[PDB]
Amino acid sequence: MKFAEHLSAHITPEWRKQYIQYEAFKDMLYSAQDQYFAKFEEKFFQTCEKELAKINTFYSEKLAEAQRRFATLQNELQSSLDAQKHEERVQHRNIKDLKLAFSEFYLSLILLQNYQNLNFTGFRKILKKHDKILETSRGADWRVAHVEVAPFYTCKKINQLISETEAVVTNELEQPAPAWTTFRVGLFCGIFIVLNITLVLAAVFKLETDRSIWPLIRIYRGGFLLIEFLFLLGINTYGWRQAGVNHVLIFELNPRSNLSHQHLFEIAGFLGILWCLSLLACFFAPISVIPTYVYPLALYGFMVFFLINPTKTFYYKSRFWLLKLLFRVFTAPFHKVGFADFWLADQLNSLSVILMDLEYMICFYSLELKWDESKGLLPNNSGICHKYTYGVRAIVQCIPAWLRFIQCLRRYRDTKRAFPHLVNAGKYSTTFFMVTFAALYSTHKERGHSDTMVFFYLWIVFYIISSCYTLIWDLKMDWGLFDKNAGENTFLREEIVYPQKAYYYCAIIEDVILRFAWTIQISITSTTLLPHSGDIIATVFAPLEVFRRFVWNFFRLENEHLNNCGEFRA
Ligand X SMILES: O=P(O)(O)O[C@H]1[C@H](OP(=O)(O)O)[C@@H](OP(=O)(O)O)[C@@H](OP(=O)(O)O)[C@H](OP(=O)(O)O)[C@H]1OP(=O)(O)O
Ligand Y SMILES: CC(C)CCC[C@@H](C)[C@H]1CC[C@H]2[C@@H]3CC=C4C[C@@H](O)CC[C@]4(C)[C@H]3CC[C@]12C
Ligand Z SMILES: CCCCCCCCCCCCCCCC(=O)O
Give the contacts of 447 (CB within 8 A, at least 6 positions apart).
Answer: none
Binding flag, residue 235, ligand 3PE (CB under 6 A): yes
Strands (E), 33-83: none
Q: What does the DSSP assignment read for 443-462?
A: HHHHHT-TTHHHHHHHHHHH
Long-range pairs of 533-536 with CB within 8 A, sequence gap ≥ 24: 534/386, 535/214, 535/217, 535/218
Q: Torsion over CA of 42, 46, 51 and 56, rounded to 10 degrees?
A: 130
Binding flag, residue 1, ligand X (CB under 6 A): yes
Residue 422: phi and psi, rounded to 5, are -95, -30
CA-to-CA distance for 498 and 211, rounded, in angstroms? 50
**Which residue, 441, 465, 467, is CA-closest to 453?**
441
Give the contacts of 59 (CB within 8 A, at least 6 positions apart).
Answer: 112, 115, 116, 151, 152, 158
> Among its own copies, ligand Y, ligand X, none, what binds residue 507 when CB lies within 5 to 8 Å by partner kind?
ligand Y
CA angle, residues 15, 17, 21, in degrees to nearest 5: 110
CB 231 within 8 A of CB 265: yes
Instruction: Give the DSSP H/E element, type plus range, for residue 200.
Output: helix 179-201
> Among ligand Y, ligand 3PE, ligand X, none, what binds residue 435 when CB lies within 5 to 8 Å by partner kind?
ligand Y
> Among ligand Z, ligand 3PE, ligand X, none, what binds residue 64 when CB lies within 5 to 8 Å by partner kind?
none
| Closer of 122 and 391 to ligand Y (Cβ) | 391
- Provide, rounded to whole angstroms, the least separation between the CB of residue 539 and ligand Y: 19
- Judged by the rule CB under 6 A, the positions of this chain that interact with ligand Y are 239, 242, 297, 300, 304, 355, 358-359, 362-363, 365-366, 391-392, 394-396, 398, 429, 432, 435-436, 439, 443, 498-499, 503, 506-507, 509-510, 551, 554
> Among its own copies, ligand Z, ligand X, none, what binds residue 28 when CB lies within 5 to 8 Å by partner kind?
its own copies
| Closer of 60 and 309 to ligand Z (Cβ) | 309
Binding flag, residue 188, its own copies (CB under 8 A): yes
Please pick, from the candidates 35, 137, 180, 413, the single residue that binds ligand Z as defined by CB under 6 A.
180
Window 263-322: residues binding ligand 3PE (CB under 6 A): 265, 267, 277-278, 280-281, 284, 286, 295, 298, 300, 303-304, 306-307, 315, 317-319, 321-322
Please pick, from the candidates 13, 310, 448, 499, the single residue that binds its own copies as defined by CB under 8 A.
13
| Closer of 313 and 485 to ligand Z (Cβ) | 313
**Which residue, 309, 321, 235, 230, is CA-closest to 275?**
230
CA-to-CA distance for 322 and 251, rounded, in angstroms? 12
| Closer of 62 and 261 to ligand Y (Cβ) | 261
- Which residues form the interface with ligand 3PE (CB under 6 A)? 176-177, 179, 182-183, 185, 189, 191-194, 196-198, 200-202, 205-206, 222, 226, 233, 235, 237-238, 253-254, 257-262, 265, 267, 277-278, 280-281, 284, 286, 295, 298, 300, 303-304, 306-307, 315, 317-319, 321-322, 351, 354, 358
Could you list the residues that contact ligand X (CB under 6 A)?
1-3, 125, 129
Binding site membership: which residues? 346, 349, 427-428, 515, 548-549
